[PDB]
């Protein structure tokens, strides 16, 4: 079986974090998960633990009530997170609520199970619009906004930089498909041609991404910008295919939140990602998490089982006498090693902690609306009713960890803002992400001089020169036209269609109207 991160308490809350990577396509049926993950894994687990410690310490939030947890590996895989959710359901101390998981596609698979047992789920990174259906997903909520905004923002970015003929790639799954189809419905309505829409799984082989990159160079040179509604490793695979083929620098990738500022995606293939514009969600680094995490040591921390593996992996050494020692690494772990070296905090850590607080404050509102005087759990919440917990969680009005009031709408979604990033070079051979814009409630603000300072053109046809040249569409696509001139008697009515002057009249010098022949 899989080891779990256990913590006792008067109320145990479930958690699903991607401690390991998705199992290799070879051993998928075996469900043998891949390498350990820090930001989406270990860090989120320790955040769960410490946040529950704080909720216990806090006398205002849930007084006389201890919060325990059962933290299980999601592996960013539907089947693995579903087996572990079954291990949550195994009882029917019961699991009151569930936090996570990461991928919207996996979150649906989990929700489908949890809803049957009235267990409210709160996702930190699942953004898909389909999860806004509360008839399909009654007991689902998320602290991040629907992707109907992020798609609109991506469309607005395409609009601002006068891009019309674009290629479109998305990760095969609910997140990618929902986002891409919303981008299709919005861009096409706003007059943006989609050269071709491509879908690929994140764990597809090298040859598969090579084929994808070749199919992307099929539309070159017209369609250079690639609207990517791709999670992480999909963008990474694209960059690695650009290294393999040599098609680097020829495209411009417009990534979604799957590649917000993730260094694990661009590290090692920096030149290939240069110029890429991506979308992040408004999550300021949670101050007190770094103070807890960076002080952690493998000798001290003994509640996270994977911390031994993760410590041996991040430093690539073997913890000499420790229990879960792995002989693989040729080096031995020194006492000088510390996490502060090359520390990169999880981008969505704020949402993780805010979701844990969402569950806590929902339980507290239910506590006050059922056991007013009794300090702690009374006989009315023995047992805790899941339906009442959902009704109290939807009506939660609290101030978040980022100093911003978190609230939930009718569809169980939370409001959100986005930061637009750019992977440019900050110096010779050095590359890093930089904030270049923002998107909130429709308004898109950008610093246009920071992105290019150099400009890129991704259109299928250059605007017809003013004089008399009309826009005549080609064989198939709208944005593809052939600038054809007008007859001497014809004046240009509108950009698209030409109109002829009647007998005696003749087109004016500006070719906007007619004028009598002298």
């Amino acid at each position: 079986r899989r080891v779990v991160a256990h913590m006792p308490g008067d109320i145990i809350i479930g958690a699903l974090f991607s401690v390991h990577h998705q199992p290799t396509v070879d051993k998928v049926h075996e469900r043998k998960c891949g390498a350990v993950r820090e930001q989406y894994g270990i860090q989120r687990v320790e955040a769960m633990l410490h946040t529950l410690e704080r909720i216990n310490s806090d006398p205002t939030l849930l007084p006389n009530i201890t919060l325990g947890c059962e933290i299980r590996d999601s592996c960013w895989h539907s089947a693995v997170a579903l087996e572990q959710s079954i291990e949550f359901i195994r009882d029917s101390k019961p699991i009151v609520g569930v936090i996570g998981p990461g991928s919207s596609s996996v979150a649906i698979q989990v929700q489908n199970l949890l809803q049957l047992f009235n267990i409210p789920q709160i996702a930190y990174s699942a953004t898909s619009m389909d999860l806004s259906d509360k008839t399909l997903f009654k007991y689902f909520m998320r602290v991040v906004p629907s992707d109907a905004q992020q798609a609109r923002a991506m469309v607005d970015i395409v609009k601002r930089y006068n891009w019309t003929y674009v290629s479109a790639v998305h990760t095969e799954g609910n997140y990618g498909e929902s986002g891409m189809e919303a981008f299709k419905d919005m861009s096409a309505k706003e007059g943006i041609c989609i050269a071709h829409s491509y879908k690929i799984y994140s764990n597809a082989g090298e040859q598969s991404f090579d084929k994808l990159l070749k199919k992307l160079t099929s539309h070159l040179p017209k369609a250079r910008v690639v609207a990517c509604f791709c999670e992480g490793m999909t963008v990474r695979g694209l960059l690695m295919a650009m290294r393999r083929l040599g098609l680097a620098g020829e495209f411009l990738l417009l990534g979604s939140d799957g590649w917000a500022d993730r260094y694990d995606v661009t590290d090692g293939y920096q030149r290939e990602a240069v110029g890429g514009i991506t979308i992040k969600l408004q999550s300021p680094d949670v101050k007190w998490f770094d103070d807890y995490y960076l002080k952690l040591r493998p000798e001290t921390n003994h509640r996270n089982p994977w911390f031994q593996e993760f410590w041996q992996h991040r430093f690539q050494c073997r913890l000499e006498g420790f229990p879960q020692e792995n002989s693989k690494y040729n080096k031995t772990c020194n006492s000088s090693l510390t996490l502060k070296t090359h520390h990169v905090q999880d981008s969505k850590m704020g949402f993780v902690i805010n979701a844990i607080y969402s569950m806590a404050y929902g339980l507290h509102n239910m506590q006050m609306s059922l056991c007013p005087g009794y300090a702690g759990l009374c006989d009315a919440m023995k047992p805790i009713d899941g339906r009442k917990l959902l009704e109290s969680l939807m009506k939660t009005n609290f101030t978040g960890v980022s100093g911003d009031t978190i609230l939930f709408d009718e569809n169980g979604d939370s409001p959100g803002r986005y930061e637009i990033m750019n992977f440019k070079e900050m110096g010779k051979d050095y590359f890093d992400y930089i904030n270049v814009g923002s998107w909130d409630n429709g308004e898109l603000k950008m610093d246009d001089d920071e992105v290019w300072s150099n400009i890129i053109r991704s259109v299928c046809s250059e605007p017809c020169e003013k004089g008399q040249i009309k826009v005549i569409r080609k064989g198939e696509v709208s944005c593809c036209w052939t600038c054809t001139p007008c007859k001497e008697n014809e004046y240009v009515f509108d950009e698209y269609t030409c109109k002829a002057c009647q007998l005696g009249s003749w087109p004016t010098d500006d070719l906007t109207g007619c004028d009598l022949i002298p």
Partner: nanobody
Amino acid sequence: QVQLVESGGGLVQAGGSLRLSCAASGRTFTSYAMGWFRQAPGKERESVAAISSSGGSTHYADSVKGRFTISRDNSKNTVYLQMNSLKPEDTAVYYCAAAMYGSRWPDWEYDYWGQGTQVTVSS
């Protein structure tokens, strides 16, 4: 909730050999490390040998170095301690204990015990 059973002990002559077994109940024995330690009457308890949760990497006390060997078959879900050329100072109650999460052995947090097998080495 894992339960351990010790076996293999008894009584042996001076310089003889004796092999020790310890079996665990339930899965996730592969997730726990294992360490045998002995305790004699009056004397305080001494950590004998230890093997990592994955196996392969082993540690021994200076007293039993070059004399004992600890091993484990995870498929059998069992750990073993072969005590070649025993001495009279080895007479004690040997215990087998599981430890997920420790530090450099002998510093481990043992969070499961076993019954205990009595080993008597006659002069």
